[PDB]
Amino acid sequence: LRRNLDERDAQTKQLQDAVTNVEKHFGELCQIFAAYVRKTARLRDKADLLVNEINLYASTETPNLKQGLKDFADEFAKLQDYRQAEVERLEAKVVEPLKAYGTIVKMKRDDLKATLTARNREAKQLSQLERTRQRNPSDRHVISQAETELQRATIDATRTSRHLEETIDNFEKQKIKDIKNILSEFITIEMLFHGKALEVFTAAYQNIQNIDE
Amino acid sequence: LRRNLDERDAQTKQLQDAVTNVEKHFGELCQIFAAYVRKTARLRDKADLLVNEINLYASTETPNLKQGLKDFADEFAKLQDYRQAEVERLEAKVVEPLKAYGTIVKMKRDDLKATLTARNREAKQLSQLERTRQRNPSDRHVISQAETELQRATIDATRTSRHLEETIDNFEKQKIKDIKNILSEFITIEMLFHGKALEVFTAAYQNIQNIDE
């Protein structure tokens, strides 16, 4: 029935738009997290430049001031190693899992296309059956054959749509697990870095106090 | 005496090179700290983009997942306000004090130039005195006048050099205080930010756990 076909299509469009919504927003988050990683690395570069200049300036100075400056530079350089570990973990645990949704989305689009193909085959077999009844009204045999082929197309379309509903449902379940895990990893990777920074800067504060002024 | 003038000049050259060494290295540190600040701000920009996308994606989602995402975005946005305070303090307490050494260096160069000028005047008055003795060997009056003017130039050069030694000595004392204070401020400003980040990310870890998966 026509009012049922409008409903059936609108419901598949929702599954289609559900895949698109994730493709769009996980993909945007993926680009932003990659840019966040690049900006973290570019900040590490400037911190390296500071380490080098403090060391070079320290090499020109009186002994106690030189030692205090080198000790600071040694601690701060340690912080940039932790920043490098933060960059690598963010690439592996945040950017790469979001990037993998390109392939997940492609597989869902195949399931959606198979459903559209099966429904076109069904609609074609239904129009075939009505035409065959009209051209050969009294040929029970060829009508029965067209009825049998419609029933095959119908159950194949139902089963293809039934599989689609299951894979999209699993896709939504895994979407929630993934976004929880991806943001959790981002939070713990950052927390690890900020905790190490506090350790480093606490010690660096001592090495500056020992500079005899 | 000539061996004394080589010594006297080499010692003023050391004062001159001491001003240059600070000009060069405080100026390099100033440029690097400014670039470090710009890279911190550019990392804040990317974090803002993450806040916006998480909010926009959350506006499309089921109620519990939407709320969990918005709560994360609200906490992380709080972290970028602390990053903005870190940027402002680094500009005011680290970059600006290093930048102020352009003016300090200029004043020391004036003291150095006054010393060179006074020594040229002295050397000229000494050559004048020897010439006057040679052209008027028996004019005790004009010789005595040239001797008196040499003694004025000599004590003026001694006093100008004596003032130079005092201002460079004070300049070295203040250099050590300043570099200790500037690096201490950098360390405490960073420590403050990393401590606030730990607070924010600890709370953000809860808001992610409440997402029903």
Author numbering:
A (entry chain A), B (entry chain A): 2 to 214
Quote from the publication.
FAM92A (family with sequence similarity 92A), a classical BAR protein, regulates ciliary assembly, mitochondrial ultrastructure, and neuronal membrane dynamics, yet its molecular mechanisms remain elusive. Mouse FAM92A possesses a central BAR domain (amino acids 70–283) flanked by unstructured regions at both the N and C termini. In ciliogenesis, FAM92A plays a critical role through its interaction with Chibby1 (CBY1).
In this study, employing biochemical and structural biology approaches, we demonstrated that the BAR domain of mouse FAM92A forms a dimer and resolved its crystal structure at 2.2 Å resolution. Like other BAR domains, the FAM92A BAR domain adopts an antiparallel dimeric arrangement, with the two monomers oriented oppositely along their long axes, forming a symmetric, crescent-shaped structure stabilized by a crystallographic twofold rotation axis. This dimerization buries an extensive interface of ∼2700 Å2. The interface can be broadly divided into two distinct regions: interface 1, on the convex surface, involves antiparallel α3 helices, whereas interface 2, on the concave surface, comprises antiparallel α1 helices. The most intense positive potential is located centrally, contributed by positively charged residues (R108, K109, R112, R114, and K116) from the dimer-forming α1 helices (denoted as region 1). Consistent with previous studies and the established properties of BAR domains, a substantial fraction of WT FAM92A BAR is cosedimented with brain liposomes, confirming its membrane-binding capability. In line with our aforementioned analysis, mutating the residues in region 1 (R108, K109, R112, R114, and K116) reduced the amount of copelleted protein by approximately 90% compared with WT, underscoring the critical role of this central region in lipid binding. Mutating L120 to the negatively charged glutamic acid, together with I257 to the polar glutamine, abolished dimer formation, as shown by SEC–MALS analysis.
